Structure 1
Amino acid sequence: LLNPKAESLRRDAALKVNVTSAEGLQSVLETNLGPKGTLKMLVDGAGNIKLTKDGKVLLTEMQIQSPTAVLIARAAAAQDEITGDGTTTVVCLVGELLRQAHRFIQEGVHPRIITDGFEIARKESMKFLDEFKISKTNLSNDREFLLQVARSSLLTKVDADLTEVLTPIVTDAVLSVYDAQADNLDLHMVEIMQMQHLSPKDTTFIKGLVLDHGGRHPDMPTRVKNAYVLILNVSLEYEKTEVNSGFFYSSADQRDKLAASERKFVDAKLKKIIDLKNEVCGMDPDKGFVIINQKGIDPMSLDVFAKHNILALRRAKRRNMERLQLVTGGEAQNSVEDLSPQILGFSGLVYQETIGEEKFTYVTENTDPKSCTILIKGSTHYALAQTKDAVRDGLRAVANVLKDKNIIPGAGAFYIALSRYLRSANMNKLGAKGKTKTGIEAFAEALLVIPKTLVKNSGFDPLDVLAMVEDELDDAQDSDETRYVGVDLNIGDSCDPTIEGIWDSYRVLRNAITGATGIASNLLLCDELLRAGR
């Protein structure tokens, strides 16, 4: 039964391909789980090499040939947008679920029987999750806790030294933009910038915005105290006669004097801007004046400002012009002709930083900036790529915890407890089927791929570390007390994740199990591979 230009893969070979391929993809990502995982180098073939641990980047850019591995990788990518994390967790769960299922399928267990067992265990796992979770305080003054969350999301993906730098950066950046009111939380209020020529350790939190173009006159202040902000969309470059004209003169000195008269077209605008300061805290102590002009400013116009200790910046990007109106409170003027004292915004220190190749202007200390900036430092695209991923994900991690009060103690306590729960609940209930109970046991065992992989990557023997966690967990239950018991990846013994500070997202773990269950089921239910036209 074969048509030319077609193939029908039968005799359970489709299952053998699906499981073998999944074990391949598992083997790749299994080496990168937890803070003890490895780094991968991704070579684009053009000479640019990316360094990352991020599962989303790894699966997105890594070339995959196995059609089955493509299915799992893309399905995980779908969960990445839904959950914001858990990429490796899903792939590891899918792989082990298929491995455990395959061992039973070889023994005569129908793929559907296992699949139904997976669905039962999944539903029971979600019930456990509901009793496992801890309800966090709704207080936004939980900084001491959110620091632990930032460390949990950062430490996994950084060199553990950068963690000390980024932890307060992620934590305070989101708390700054998170209104302490039952309103909302938008992590897009924290901008992600990158700069070269500094070590990654120098990643810094900036309360306001940063602009690229600086001043181009040596006498303008590099530090403006309690600045007023003018937002101006019109050029102050040397202007010419409005209409076609020329210089008609009799004596050489008249040539430049006539040009000086032509200069009046722009000088009149300069005077109005200088008078603007004179009207609004002209000579008041501890007051300044900065201009963030979207368009150019003549070197002569800058000299006019420099003489008055005014910091006149030029050729700002629109993106910052619109934000700075919200940050500083001032209004943009399309022309100096509309200039008025009610236009100016207000901010604290405006600082010009100069480095070898570039200048940067800082607009910090605003009354209500409604925006923050994080500056990611590095010497090469290696540190810049890794740090950027760490910051973007850390901001999301602490954002999800602030939005969703449900927190899950980590260190493997969730998945190890699920194994114990499902093992006992299954034998205690046996309400599935004489055969289906096989799939439930396969599901419960597969869940342990996560705590086992976390330990293996640490160099500790999973055979001893998991046993020690199970022992203390059982002792707590026999003692009739509630205790969260997880893995200490540095000592090798058990720990309490709620004292150590190891926290997982409620939403990620909820969907990670549900997704991995569906992905493994979709492959276990595949009886034949059908190829045509290739």
Structure 2
Amino acid sequence: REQGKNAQRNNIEAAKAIADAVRTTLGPKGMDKMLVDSIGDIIISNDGATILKEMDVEHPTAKMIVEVSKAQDTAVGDGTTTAVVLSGELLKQAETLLDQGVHPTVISNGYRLAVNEARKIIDEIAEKSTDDATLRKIALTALSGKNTGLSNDFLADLVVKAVNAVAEVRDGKTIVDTANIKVDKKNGGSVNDTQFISGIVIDKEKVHSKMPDVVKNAKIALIDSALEIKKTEIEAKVQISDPSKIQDFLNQETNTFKQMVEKIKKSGANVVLCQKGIDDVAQHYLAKEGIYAVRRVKKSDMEKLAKATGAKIVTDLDDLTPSVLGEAETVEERKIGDDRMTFVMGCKNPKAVSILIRGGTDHVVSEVERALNDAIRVVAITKEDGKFLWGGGAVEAELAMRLAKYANSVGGREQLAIEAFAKALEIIPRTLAENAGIDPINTLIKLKADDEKGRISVGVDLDNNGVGDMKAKGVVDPLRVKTHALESAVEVATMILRIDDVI
């Protein structure tokens, strides 16, 4: 148990630490971490949430900072590093106000004021635009400090395209259900070989060799149950008194599978995607019937497939009518890499696409996937929000400048508190610079002035080796991410600030 000062400074020290663990992954010139467990083993990533979910955090307070990365990730997709680094800085900056005598609460109130205020300035200075031109920009930037190769422009384009292909419009606004974009990956070396499939890809093979290698104009039946011999819920026993029956019983079994197949054929279905298993005799006849079957299909998939082809997931083959079959121009098995996979294309419903990721190693494909997800999520958000911000320290520098001014128009103690939040915001520019290997302080000094002269969009230009116009370079931060990062950070910073005794 720790009381007062001990507890607090200690808590701020904990948060600060966990926060630095990811600090170097920020921005373009970011680095990666290598986490190794006991069995699975090596995991190499640049993703904030990953490096932390996998990290073995022990200190309670540190566990709380980790919580924000997992939230940032699942709630907004991008920004996990930022929210962590920011929480570390708000807690750190507060430690000064604390030593001077300012009460944790008023500090918590300053951060409220400040964040609520910033939550307006950004929305004030946010830049609207929904054209593919910028959607592409959001993408390029979301893929920066990541090990994706030189293909980023290619990847950005895949993402913009996938988002646009699934973006629907309802009562006036555009919605993008990221769930309609199925991303997968396969070791085969390339990264450029990343295919954009206008359909649903299933990492599965057809169950039986003789089944059609491809099926055009397919009537797709999704099945909940396993095409196998079922047993009655009430224990049963078979008493054979006549030798003859021993065969008859063995036949019932066969005729059972024959009928299952018959029900299936009768519906018109020529493609059977089974969430569960398929018996070898069932397979014999499905093949004899010429139906393309796939067993043990992932429920996640069973669902996407249902949505993409318009089919109804049926359990009781007795309710397998033509009415519940899905549609796809082609259902074809094709060998992607060492693996054979089932391609379902021309789905009744077009708002369902895939991104089959390729790349080599393994360790490179997983991450490229992680990078492509951040990109997919933010491009999607931006598609909906139609607003964005000036990246690379720009937004922050501005917010900091304005907030330090708003500070003066506030009380004594709270001012001190909001000036603290203003500085905390400068942590991003400083970080991007530090990692790039440039001079934090001067970068900041220069960045302040340019933004002060009204140059909203001057960010940290690693290329120009200092400050520069993010407008030109096209570095844009999506709105929703900034805000959740800021709000998440303030809520968690406050939580920790009030803890005066940990037991």
SS of the equivalent of 1:205 reads: strand
Alignment correspondent of 1:383: 364
Of the three residues 25, 30, 35, the one matched with 1:32 is 25
Q: Which runs of 5+ in 2 are unaligned?
A: 230-238, 245-249
Could you say if the C-alpha distance between residues 222 and 18 of structure 1 is closer, same or farther in structure 2, counting changes exceeding 3 Å?
A: same
SS of the equivalent of 2:392 reads: coil
1:200, 1:383 within 8 Å by CA — same for their partners in 2? Answer: no
Could you say if the C-alpha distance between residues 345 and 93 of structure 1 is closer, same or farther in structure 2, counting changes exceeding 3 Å?
A: closer
SS of the equivalent of 1:347 reads: strand
Alignment correspondent of 2:234: none
For residues 6-29 of structure 1, what are the alpha-carbon distances to aligned partners after superposition, in whole Å with 9 as ceiling and x for unaligned?
x5545x333332333233223212
Question: 1:386 offset after TM fit, Å?
Answer: 1.6
- How far apart, in 2, do the equivalents of 1:236 and 1:74 lie? 43
Could you say if the C-alpha distance between residues 520 and 237 of structure 1 is closer, same or farther in structure 2, counting changes exceeding 3 Å?
A: closer
The one-letter code of the counterpart of 1:153 is A
Alignment correspondent of 1:285: none
Q: Does the alignment pair 1:529 with 2:497? A: no
Question: 1:401 offset after TM fit, Å?
Answer: 1.7
The one-letter code of the counterpart of 1:490 is D
More off after superposition, 106-115 vs 393-402: 106-115
Could you say if the C-alpha distance between residues 16 and 178 of structure 1 is closer, same or farther in structure 2, counting changes exceeding 3 Å?
A: same
> 1:17-166, aligned counterparts within 5 Å?
17-46=10-39, 48-112=41-105, 114-137=107-130, 142-166=131-155
Q: Does the alignment pair 1:460 with 2:453? A: no
- TM-score (structure 1 length as normaliser): 0.76
For residues 241-275 of structure 1, what are the alpha-carbon distances to aligned partners after superposition, in whole Å with 9 as ceiling and x for unaligned?
xx999999xxxxxxxxxx99x98997799899889
Q: Which runs of 5+ in 1 are unaligned?
A: 1-6, 249-258, 281-288
Could you say if the C-alpha distance between residues 354 and 88 of structure 1 is closer, same or farther in structure 2, counting changes exceeding 3 Å?
A: closer
Could you say if the C-alpha distance between residues 293 and 514 of structure 1 is closer, same or farther in structure 2, counting changes exceeding 3 Å?
A: closer
Alignment correspondent of 1:360: 341
Alignment correspondent of 1:13: 6
Question: 1:330 offset after TM fit, Å?
Answer: 5.5
Q: Does the alignment pair 1:399 with 2:388? A: no
SS of the equivalent of 2:379 reads: helix
Alignment correspondent of 1:315: 295
Could you say if the C-alpha distance between residues 318 and 448 of structure 1 is closer, same or farther in structure 2, counting changes exceeding 3 Å?
A: closer
- How far apart, in 2, do the equivalents of 1:263 and 1:522 lie? 65
Question: 1:81 offset after TM fit, Å?
Answer: 4.1
Give the aligned CA root-mean-square deviation in angstroms.
4.1
SS of the equivalent of 1:202 reads: coil
The one-letter code of the counterpart of 2:87 is V
1:134, 1:406 within 8 Å by CA — same for their partners in 2? Answer: yes
Question: 1:455 offset after TM fit, Å?
Answer: 1.1
Could you say if the C-alpha distance between residues 453 and 365 of structure 1 is closer, same or farther in structure 2, counting changes exceeding 3 Å?
A: same
Q: Does the alignment pair 1:498 with 2:478? A: no
* Count of matched residue pairs: 486
Could you say if the C-alpha distance between residues 324 and 14 of structure 1 is closer, same or farther in structure 2, counting changes exceeding 3 Å?
A: closer
For residues 184-231 of structure 1, what are the alpha-carbon distances to aligned partners after superposition, in whole Å with 9 as ceiling and x for unaligned?
432122233343444544332222222344346767653444445466
SS of the equivalent of 1:348 reads: strand
Alignment correspondent of 2:411: 432
The one-letter code of the counterpart of 2:439 is D
Could you say if the C-alpha distance between residues 181 and 515 of structure 1 is closer, same or farther in structure 2, counting changes exceeding 3 Å?
A: closer
Of the three residues 189, 199, 221, the one matched with 1:208 is 199
Could you say if the C-alpha distance between residues 356 and 85 of structure 1 is closer, same or farther in structure 2, counting changes exceeding 3 Å?
A: closer
- How far apart, in 1, do the equivalents of 2:373 and 2:306 lie? 25
Alignment correspondent of 1:351: 332
Could you say if the C-alpha distance between residues 212 and 160 of structure 1 is closer, same or farther in structure 2, counting changes exceeding 3 Å?
A: closer
Q: Percent of aligned pairs with the same residue?
A: 32
Question: 1:122 offset after TM fit, Å?
Answer: 2.5
SS of the equivalent of 1:362 reads: strand
> 1:246-261, aligned counterparts within 5 Å?
none
- How far apart, in 2, do the equivalents of 1:18 and 1:404 lie? 37
- TM-score (structure 2 length as normaliser): 0.80
Alignment correspondent of 2:162: 173
- How far apart, in 2, do the equivalents of 1:490 and 1:361 lie? 45
1:59, 1:73 within 8 Å by CA — same for their partners in 2? Answer: yes
Question: 1:503 offset after TM fit, Å?
Answer: 2.0
